[PDB]
């Protein structure tokens, strides 16, 4: 088996990054398929409790670090090339030895920082290619550390907001 929520690294990053964009107002065209897709309804209280945690928590961490993820961003040339090659190097350093919630929450915040970077000059759509890779690595290295050790709820239980 495998729970009954339907967690998806792709959806997780999509929602996270989204808010990161909505903050400014740039209508990110993530769901290009705007053909009203109400398969099993949007209602998903299950994986919702987790979202509010990841999204909120993640932004909370970065907030505590003024110089660490941003100051480093300076070393990220903005051009239509070697975009993913530089991203992998960043996340790779994040989880050099082992993975952990704190770390996961870090890379998550990083991906967004870069996703928005493209929007700085003129590469808004890039956010799509970013969330994509973020999903590849996250699942290719964290999904194992997360699932094998509980799952997405495993974190929500450890960081359960002040009584619900």
UniProtKB/Swiss-Prot annotation:
One of its GO terms (biological process) is melanin metabolic process. Changing residue 148 to A: No effect on BAX-binding, nor on anti-apoptotic activity. Partial loss of BAX-binding and 50% decrease in anti-apoptotic activity. No effect on homodimerization. It is a single-pass membrane protein. Expressed in a variety of tissues. Changing residue 32 to A: Abolishes cleavage by caspase-3. InterPro entries: Apop_reg_Bcl2, Bcl-2-like_sf, Bcl-2_BH1-3, Bcl-2_fam, Bcl2-like, Bcl2/BclX, Bcl2_BH1_motif_CS, Bcl2_BH2_motif_CS. In the absence of growth factors, BCL2 appears to be phosphorylated by other protein kinases such as ERKs and stress-activated kinases. Dephosphorylated by protein phosphatase 2A (PP2A). Proteolytically cleaved by caspases during apoptosis. The cleaved protein, lacking the BH4 motif, has pro-apoptotic activity, causes the release of cytochrome c into the cytosol promoting further caspase activity. A motif (BH2) lies at residues 144-159. The keyword Mitochondrion applies. NCBIfam families: bcl-2. BH1 and BH2 domains are required for the interaction with BAX and for anti-apoptotic activity. The BH4 motif is required for anti-apoptotic activity and for interaction with RAF1 and EGLN3. This is Apoptosis regulator Bcl-2. It comes from Homo sapiens.
């Amino acid at each position: 088996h495998a729970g009954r929520t339907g967690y998806d690294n792709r959806e997780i990053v999509m929602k996270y990054i989204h808010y990161k964009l909505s903050q400014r107002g740039y209508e990110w065209d993530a769901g290009d398929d705007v053909e009203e897709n109400r398969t099993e309804a949007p209602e998903g209280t299950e994986s919702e409790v987790v979202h509010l945690t990841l999204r909120q928590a993640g932004d909370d961490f970065s907030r505590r670090y003024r110089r660490d993820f941003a100051e480093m961003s300076s070393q990220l040339h903005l051009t239509p090339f070697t975009a993913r090659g530089r991203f992998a190097t960043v996340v790779e350093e994040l989880f050099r030895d082992g993975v952990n919630w704190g770390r996961i929450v870090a890379f998550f915040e990083f991906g967004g920082v870069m996703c928005v970077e493209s929007v700085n000059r003129e590469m808004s759509p890039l956010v799509d290619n970013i969330a994509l890779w973020m999903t590849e690595y996250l699942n290719r290295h964290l999904h194992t550390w997360i699932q094998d050790n509980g799952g997405w709820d495993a974190f929500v239980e450890l960081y359960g907001p002040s009584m619900r």
